[PDB]
Amino acid sequence: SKSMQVPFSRCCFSFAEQEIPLRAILCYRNTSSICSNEGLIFKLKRGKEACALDTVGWVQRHRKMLRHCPSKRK
């Protein structure tokens, strides 16, 4: 109890490879090297985050406008 880390977590299975727009996303942030192949993550309004690679393409336009999420407590 209270040993491991609740948030953060590891990579995901289904990333945001689709054409997810900014209307659904709020912020993006790179993850650890657990992915072992460009690990990226995002933030949505639903009250959660989304997994991604890093330089997929649609991330650039998202990160070009948005930036690395501040703090580390949701």
Distances (CA, A) of 57 to 1, 29, 32, 39, 65: 40, 15, 20, 14, 13
Distance CA 67, CA 34 (A): 21
Distance CA 15, CA 4 (A): 24
User: What 3-state class would DSSP assign to 63?
Assistant: helix
Distances (CA, A) of 21 to 4, 6, 8, 14, 29: 33, 28, 23, 16, 16
Domain boundaries, the chain: 1-74
Name the CATH code of domain 1-74 (choices 1.10.8.50, 3.40.190.10, 2.40.50.40, 3.10.20.740).
2.40.50.40
13, 31, 4, 72 alpha-carbon torsion, rounded to 10°:
-130
Q: Tokens representing 60?
A: 């650039």
Q: Which technique was the structure solved with, according to the deposited record?
A: NMR
- Please, which residues bridge with residue 52 across strands? 40
